[PDB]
Each structure stands twice: as C-alpha cells, then as structure tokens.
Design a protein around this ligand. Structure first.
Ligand code: 8E1
Ligand code: CL
Length: 322
C-alpha cells in the first residue's frame, strides 16, 4: 500500500477521527482515497468523503489547503448559500486536515467532499458537445463559484471540464476543484500589481488560459471570466480556433489577442453559418471591458446568460441535462 491501509483510522488536527477506504481512480489529481467517519463498519462505495494526501514539502497541497481552510469551511459556505439565496455552491467542503507518518516520512492529509464523474468524461461520452441549456446552466453555477472565491481573495486560473466534478449523489450540482495553483490576488483587500507572481507561475491549460496568463502576469478576476468564455465555446462546438497549435503558446496568445479585438470574427470562426448564440458574444464583450484590478459585475454576467435561457424557451431551474 502506498499511503493508507484500507480500514486505517486517522485523526485530524481538531481530533476528529476518520477511516480510510479504497483509492478513488488513478487520475492526475494525486493520492486520493475514499473516507468516512470512524465506526465499526468498513468504508464502502457509500463513502461521503475523501482523503487527499501528499508529502509535507509539497507546495501545491499547502496552497490548496490554505484556500480550503480560508474559504471552504462548511459554515462559511452555508452562510453564503442562505444570504445569496442559492440552491447550493460548487466549492468543495473542507472537513479537516492532519499529519500522518509513514516509514519515518511526514505527510499532510485533507478530508473533503466526495464527487463522482468529471465533466470531461460526460462531454466525451456526448461526442464532445453540450447543449445550449447544459452550457448556460453550467456557466450560471461557475459564475456563482467564481464570485464566491473572488470575494474571498482568490482566483482559480484553470477552469475546465476535468476540474468540474459532479456530486456523487446529485447530477445537477457541479463543483470546481483543484486549487493547488489558485492565486490570492488581493490579500487583506490589497489588489496585486500588474506583474508576475515571483513565487509561482500560474500558466493554466494552454487552450483555455487567459491573455493575462500568456503575458506572464499574475491571474486576476477578468482572466477567470475569460477562461469560462473559452470553455463555453469549446463545450457548444467541440472546437477552438487555436486547438491545432497548442505546442506553440505564441500562436495561442496571438490568436486570442486578435479574437478579443473582433469578437464577431471569433463568433464567425466558431459558429458555422451565422448561428452564434447572442449571449456568448455579449458575455465575451462584457469581460473585454474589464480592467486588470476591476471588480466584475457578476449579476449582469448571469443576466446575459439568463437572456440565453429565455431564447430557448427555458428558465433557471438548475437542470444540467447530462
Ligand atoms: N471522471 S472520473 O470518474 O475519473 C473521477 C474523477 C475524480 C474523482 N474524484 C476526485 C475527487 C473527489 O471525489 N473528491 C474530491 C475533492 C477534492 C478534489 N480536488 C481535486 S480532485 C478532488 C476530489 C472521481 C472520479
Ligand atoms: Cl467534431
């Protein structure tokens, strides 16, 4: 066994006891096991949690842990859900963390909410397409998530279908994961300058990353919204104009800078035969008007997408249609 014996009892820093289960998949998310509260019974497939574990010196886990401790406390999320009158919030809940010894070496572990399949698998099973309803419903919930993490001094910088996981018991609830390279843009309310972060480089995923990230500057709120824009196009059409040139970041940036200058040209490239949904253009055009340090007007962005739902004879009923 690499880290935890199936059935082992671990106690976190607040003295809460958990039992370890089987590893969850083999994905490039690190070492993850199913977990539950300590009891006589074994941890089965009905496990509500997971234990993510990495060595103490691992920088990304610590950064990820700090974000979870700061912005993902269960009560902190519920207070936001009640005040903003949301059905749920797609920020995974943090249940505790601790240190674990294995063969004289120290490891830090974190207990989190458990999820089922990622969006990418569902997307690939649907022949690399998502309906206008699915895309607009996903996007409204990601705007809820982004407003929350932005209001908590963080930017994600890597929004994509493989970082969007679905609730293990509820298929209409999507969660944004992976904060290993999340960035604290305005610590103690002081916005970061328009320059690189000296400690780490937040490149993201080449196809979806923002122009700011391509320019080698620290990610900001506008960049998270821009990444979401490229996701929406990729989900509706299965393509992006720069998809055959990923090994060249100069090309990807060049293409993005040109397309930001003329959004009608992007709509023309991505949508065949002048069939482009108006709310995508109105959204790209609103994000375009944002300054590096500017607070986005989220409700206005959600209203642009709500107009898109009315155009297809629908309402925000929270149905993902997966
Ligand atoms: N498409 S899939 O079927 O291969 C698949 C992918 C992924 C997972 N599960 C990953 C996680 C899970 O269940 N809980 C958390 C909490 C935090 C977190 N942070 C990065 S990954 C992650 C996870 C299950 C199935
Ligand atoms: Cl295709």
């Amino acid at each position: 066994a690499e880290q935890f014996a199936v059935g082992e009892i671990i106690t976190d820093m607040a003295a809460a006891a958990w039992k370890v289960g089987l590893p969850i998949g083999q994905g490039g998310f690190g070492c993850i096991y199913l977990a539950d509260m300590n009891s006589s019974e074994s941890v089965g497939s009905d496990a509500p949690c997971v234990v993510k574990v990495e060595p103490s010196d691992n920088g990304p886990l610590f950064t990820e842990l700090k974000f979870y401790q700061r912005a993902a406390k269960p009560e902190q999320i519920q207070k936001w859900i009640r005040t903003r009158k949301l059905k749920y919030l797609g920020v995974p809940k943090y249940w505790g963390s601790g240190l674990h010894d294995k063969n004289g070496k120290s490891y830090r572990f974190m207990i989190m909410d458990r999820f089922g399949s990622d969006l990418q698998k569902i997307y690939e099973a649907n022949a690399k397409r998502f309906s206008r309803k699915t895309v607009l419903q996903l996007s409204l919930r990601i705007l809820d998530i982004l407003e929350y993490i932005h209001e908590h001094e963080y930017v994600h910088g890597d929004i994509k279908a493989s970082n969007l996981l679905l609730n293990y018991k509820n298929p209409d609830q999507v969660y944004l994961v992976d904060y290993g390279l999340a960035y604290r843009y305005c610590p103690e309310g002081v916005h970061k300058a328009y320059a690189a972060d000296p400690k780490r480089c937040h490149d993201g995923t080449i196809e979806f990353t923002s122009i700011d990230a391509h320019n080698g500057v620290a990610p900001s709120r506008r960049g998270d919204l821009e990444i979401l824009g490229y996701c929406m196009i990729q989900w509706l059409t299965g393509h992006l104009p720069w998809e055959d040139n990923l090994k060249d970041p100069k090309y990807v940036r060049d293409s993005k800078i040109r397309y930001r200058e003329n959004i009608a040209s992007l709509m023309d490239k991505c949508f065949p035969a002048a069939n482009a949904p108006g709310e995508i253009a109105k959204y790209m055009e609103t994000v375009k008007l944002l300054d590096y340090t500017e607070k986005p007007l989220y409700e206005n962005l959600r209203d642009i997408l709500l107009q898109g739902l009315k155009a297809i004879g629908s309402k925000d009923d929270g149905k993902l249609d997966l």
